[PDB]
Amino acid sequence: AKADYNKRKPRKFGKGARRCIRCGQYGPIIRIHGLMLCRHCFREVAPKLGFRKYE
Amino acid sequence: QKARIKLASTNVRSLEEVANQIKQIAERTGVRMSGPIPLPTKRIRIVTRKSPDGEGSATFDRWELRIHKRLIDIEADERAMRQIMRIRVPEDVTIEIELI
Amino acid sequence: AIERYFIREAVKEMLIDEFLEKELRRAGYGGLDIKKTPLGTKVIIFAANPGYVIGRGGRRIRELTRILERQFGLENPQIDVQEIKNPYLNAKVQAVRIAQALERGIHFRRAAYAAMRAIMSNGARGVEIRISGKLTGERAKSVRFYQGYLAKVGNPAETLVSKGYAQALLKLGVIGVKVAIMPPDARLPDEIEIIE
Amino acid sequence: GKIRQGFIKRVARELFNKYPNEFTRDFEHNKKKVEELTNVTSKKIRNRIAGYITKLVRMKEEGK
RNA sequence: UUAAUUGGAUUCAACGCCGGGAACCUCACCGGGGGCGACGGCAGGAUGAAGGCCAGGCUGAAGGUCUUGCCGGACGCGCCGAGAGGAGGUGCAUGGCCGCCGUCAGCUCGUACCGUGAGGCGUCCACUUAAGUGUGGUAACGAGCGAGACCCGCGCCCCCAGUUGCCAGUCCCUCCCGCUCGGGAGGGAGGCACUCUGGGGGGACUGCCGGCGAUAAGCCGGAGGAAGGGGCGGGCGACGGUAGGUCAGUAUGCCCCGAAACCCCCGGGCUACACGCGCGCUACAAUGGGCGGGACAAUGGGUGCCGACCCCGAAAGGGGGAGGUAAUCCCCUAAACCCGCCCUCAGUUCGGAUCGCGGGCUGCAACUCGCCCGCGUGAAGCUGGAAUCCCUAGUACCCGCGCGUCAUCAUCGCGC
Numbered sequence A: 001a002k003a004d005y006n007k008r009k010p011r012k013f014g015k016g017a018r019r020c021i022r023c024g025q026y027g028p029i030i031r032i033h034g035l036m037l038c039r040h041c042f043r044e045v046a047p048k049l050g051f052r053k054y055e
Numbered sequence B: 001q002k003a004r005i006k007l008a009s010t011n012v013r014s015l016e017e018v019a020n021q022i023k024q025i026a027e028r029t030g031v032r033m034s035g036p037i038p039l040p041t042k043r044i045r046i047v048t049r050k051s052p053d054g055e056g057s058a059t060f061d062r063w064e065l066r067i068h069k070r071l072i073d074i075e076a077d078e079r080a081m082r083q084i085m086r087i088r089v090p091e092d093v094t095i096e097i098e099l100i
Numbered sequence C: 001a002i003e004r005y006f007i008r009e010a011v012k013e014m015l016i017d018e019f020l021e022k023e024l025r026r027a028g029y030g031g032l033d034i035k036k037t038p039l040g041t042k043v044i045i046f047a048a049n050p051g052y053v054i055g056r057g058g059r060r061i062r063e064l065t066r067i068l069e070r071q072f073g074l075e076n077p078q079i080d081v082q083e084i085k086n087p088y089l090n091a092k093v094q095a096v097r098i099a100q101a102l103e104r105g106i107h108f109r110r111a112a113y114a115a116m117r118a119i120m121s122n123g124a125r126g127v128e129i130r131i132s133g134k135l136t137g138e139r140a141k142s143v144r145f146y147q148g149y150l151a152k153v154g155n156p157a158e159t160l161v162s163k164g165y166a167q168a169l170l171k172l173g174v175i176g177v178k179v180a181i182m183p184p185d186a187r188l189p190d191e192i193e194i195i196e
Numbered sequence D: 001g002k003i004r005q006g007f008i009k010r011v012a013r014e015l016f017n018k019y020p021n022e023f024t025r026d027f028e029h030n031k032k033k034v035e036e037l038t039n040v041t042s043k044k045i046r047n048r049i050a051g052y053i054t055k056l057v058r059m060k061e062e063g064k
Numbered sequence E: 001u002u003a004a005u006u007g008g009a010u011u012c013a014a015c016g017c018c019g020g021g022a023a024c025c026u027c028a029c030c031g032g033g034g035g036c037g038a039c040g041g042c043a044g045g046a047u048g049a050a051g052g053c054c055a056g057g058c059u060g061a062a063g064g065u066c067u068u069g070c071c072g073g074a075c076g077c078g079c080c081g082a083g084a085g086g087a088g089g090u091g092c093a094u095g096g097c098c099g100c101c102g103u104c105a106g107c108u109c110g111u112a113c114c115g116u117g118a119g120g121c122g123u124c125c126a127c128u129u130a131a132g133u134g135u136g137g138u139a140a141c142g143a144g145c146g147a148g149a150c151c152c153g154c155g156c157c158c159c160c161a162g163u164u165g166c167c168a169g170u171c172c173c174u175c176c177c178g179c180u181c182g183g184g185a186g187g188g189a190g191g192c193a194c195u196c197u198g199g200g201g202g203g204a205c206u207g208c209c210g211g212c213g214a215u216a217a218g219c220c221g222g223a224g225g226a227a228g229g230g231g232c233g234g235g236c237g238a239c240g241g242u243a244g245g246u247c248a249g250u251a252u253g254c255c256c257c258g259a260a261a262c263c264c265c266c267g268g269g270c271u272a273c274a275c276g277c278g279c280g281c282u283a284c285a286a287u288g289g290g291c292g293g294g295a296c297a298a299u300g301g302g303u304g305c306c307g308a309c310c311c312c313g314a315a316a317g318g319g320g321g322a323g324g325u326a327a328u329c330c331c332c333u334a335a336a337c338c339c340g341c342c343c344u345c346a347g348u349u350c351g352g353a354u355c356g357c358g359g360g361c362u363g364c365a366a367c368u369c370g371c372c373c374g375c376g377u378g379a380a381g382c383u384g385g386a387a388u389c390c391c392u393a394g395u396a397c398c399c400g401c402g403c404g405u406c407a408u409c410a411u412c413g414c415g416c
C-alpha cells in the first residue's frame, strides 16, 4: 500500500512513547501518579487541579 | 454484623459534616459506634523549575495537594443502615461501605 | 491507590473546561459544573447567550453530548444550560468581552473606561485592567487603568480577588487583556469594627 | 523593631474613649473584654490591642 | 577536526544551564530510499478513471518500481490556482512566563498654595525603625499601592477520638537460665494508660520590674517562663526599567519552502582530540589501610509495579512464589561510630587510573556507544605560586539514605 509509508512504529519505551496530553511535546514529562503533562503545562494548570503553594 | 465506613476528601469541612451526620444518625438510635478515627493525611508534593528557558538563576515551585481521611466502625442494624445509605455526600467526598 | 483516583478526575474536568472555553467563545462562557448521579453525569454549563449554545433547535447540544461521550470519558452525559450569576463580578467574562470589543474595532481607551464604569456601577470595591501589545505603532506598549481598593500581595490577594486573561487577535498581531476585580463583600484583615 | 501598628492604635483609642469605665490595669481582664466588644478574629491582634489599652489606662491614671 | 560533529546562553545575572543521565525514538544535523495537494477548474475516463496484488529482478530491504497478467468500479497533480503541514527566518514585530535592579523602600493621587515655565510642595527637619516603620515641628491638609498585617510548618499544654497505630499494669498457657525464692522470651484474652495520628482550644502582650531618652516614639538590662522582644524557617516581589532570555513548551503577525524547508523508514553523528577554562569526585596516608565481631534513623515510593519466604550458584545473578490498590504487605537489620588482631612512616598492606582473560542482566538491537561480577595488571600523586569561594547554631564541616529522570544507566537536581 501507500499509507504504510506514513505510519510510525508502536514504541513501548523511550522518550518517543510519551507526549503531553495538552500540547504534544516530547521530553520533560511529569509521570507522577499518572499525570502526563509537561513541566511547562503543569505550572499554569496546577491551581485548577487543586494544588497550592503553602511554602 | 459490623460495617466499616471509609471517607476521604481534599476539603476538611465537608468530611466533618458527613461524619457528624453519621454520628447523629447513630445517636438517634440505640447502636454502638466506633468513633471517627483520623488516619494520616496524604501529601502529594511536586517540585518544578519556573523559567521556560534555561537562562537566569534557577528557582523552583513546590506544589502540594492534601487528602484527608476518616474511619468509622458501626454495627449493622437495618433501621440505621438504611439512613446512612440515604445520606448523600457533597461532590468532593468519597465514601465506601463494606461488611466485616 | 486512592491518590491516583483523585488526580484522574481533576484532569478530565480541566480538559473539558478548556475545550468548552475554546468552543463556546461567542456565547460568553462562564464555567461549568459536573455532578455524578447513579444514572449518569449531569453537566451544567453557565453562559450569557443560551441560544447559541443550544443552536437553532438542538443540533448542537446533541453534538456536544456525543463529543463529550466519545472524545472525553463522561458516561451517560446530560447537558443543561443556565445563566451566569454575577456577570459583572466575573473577571474571565469581562476579559473576553473587552477582547471582543477590541476585535470589533473600538479604541482601547473607550473599551477600558466603559468596562470599568459598568463594573464599578454594579457594586465592586475595585478593578484593575491592563492592556498590552502593538497599540498605536509598531513598537509594543502597555497601559493600565485603575480605580478603587485592590490588594496585590499576600494571602488575601490570593483568595479574594478574581483574575482573568484573554487574547485579542487583530490584523497586526495579538493583544493581551488582564482584568482583576475585588467583590463587594470582601473584608481585609485590618478592617475591625466596634460592637454597639 | 517593636513599632505598634496604626490600625491597632486607632481601634484601641476608639474603644478607650467609648467605654472609659470598662478596662483596668490588668492584661487578662482587658483581653477578655476586647474579645467580647469587637469582631476581631485573630488571637495575635487581640493581644496587641489589649496591651496597648492597658498602657493607655495606666497612662491616664497617672494623669500624663 | 569532520560527510555531519544540529542549535540557544558569555561579568555578577553563560559554562551538572535549556529539568540536556541522546544506543533506536527524542532530532532539529549527515548519506540514502519512499509518501502526501481540502475546494475550484483543464486533459482524460464504465470501449473502465483513480487505486491493490502470488511469483522474480532492481535494491541495505522493499508490488517503491520493473518483468509476468490478474484483481476494482468514478473520479481525475499529467496542467493551472489554492491549501495542509513547517524544531525554516525574525525575542529588534508581539502575547504569556522567567532572571536582575531588589523582599530594596520605594511609586503616586484629590484639593489648596509657590513659579512666566519645565517643575515644586505634601515626600522636608530632629530623634527612632528591618521598613516613606513611628513620634513631635512645619503651605499644607488628607488618601492609595507597596512594608506590616496575612498563609503553611516547627517547639510547650488541655479536650475529643482508639484502627490497620500503641503494650504499662492485671490474667491463662508454653519455653529457657544460677533449679528457681528469683529473672527472661513468645502467644492468647484484655485495655487506650503511655507513644503516635489529627480536629478543636490555650499560651507572649514590651504585659511585669529598674534605667536612658522628652514626660512621646522607642532603646538597654533583669525576673517568671516550653518559648522574649518580625519567637524560629518558609510562601507571597509595588509603579517601572533592562530593545535582558524564550517564537526550539504552547498561543500569534509578517516573510519564506510548498512535490520540498512537509510526513515516514534504514544506517551514521551529537560520545571526534596537539590544546585553554568552569563546577565536582577520588587521593596524596596513622586525625590511617585490612580482616573478624557489636550498635542506633528519617523523608519518600509501589499494580506496565513492591516483592517477603524456600531452593540453586563463589559472585554478579537464576527457578518458584505469600501478602499488598497499602497507619495492615513490601522497598528496609544505613554509614560515619565502638571492640579484638595484622601492617609501623614506606611510592608502602597508601593510591586505583590504564589494560588482558572469563562470567551475567535490560532491550527489537550493546561494534561505534550501556551497566554489573571474578582473577590478573599497578600510572600521576608525598599538602599545592600569584590569586580566590562558602558560612553566625542544631548553622558550617564530616556521613550515608529517599524521590525525579528511568526498559537498562547517577560523581547531577530536589529533599531526609
Ligand SMILES: [Mg+2]
Binding pocket: C154
Ligand atoms: Mg509581607
Ligand SMILES: [Mg+2]
Binding pocket: none
Ligand atoms: Mg555545539
Ligand SMILES: [Mg+2]
Binding pocket: none
Ligand atoms: Mg546515555
Ligand SMILES: [Mg+2]
Binding pocket: none
Ligand atoms: Mg539518535
Ligand SMILES: [Mg+2]
Binding pocket: none
Ligand atoms: Mg500662577
Ligand SMILES: [Mg+2]
Binding pocket: none
Ligand atoms: Mg524638596
Ligand SMILES: [Mg+2]
Binding pocket: E132
Ligand atoms: Mg507606608
Ligand SMILES: [Mg+2]
Binding pocket: E091, E243
Ligand atoms: Mg527583548
Ligand SMILES: [Mg+2]
Binding pocket: E243
Ligand atoms: Mg535582545
Ligand SMILES: [Mg+2]
Binding pocket: E270
Ligand atoms: Mg553534547
Ligand SMILES: [Mg+2]
Binding pocket: none
Ligand atoms: Mg588499598
Ligand SMILES: [Mg+2]
Binding pocket: none
Ligand atoms: Mg562496546
Ligand SMILES: [Mg+2]
Binding pocket: E382
Ligand atoms: Mg608519604
Ligand SMILES: [Mg+2]
Binding pocket: E021, E412
Ligand atoms: Mg541532568
Ligand SMILES: [Zn+2]
Binding pocket: A020, A021, A022, A023, A024, A025, A037, A038, A039, A040, A041, E249
Ligand atoms: Zn505541555
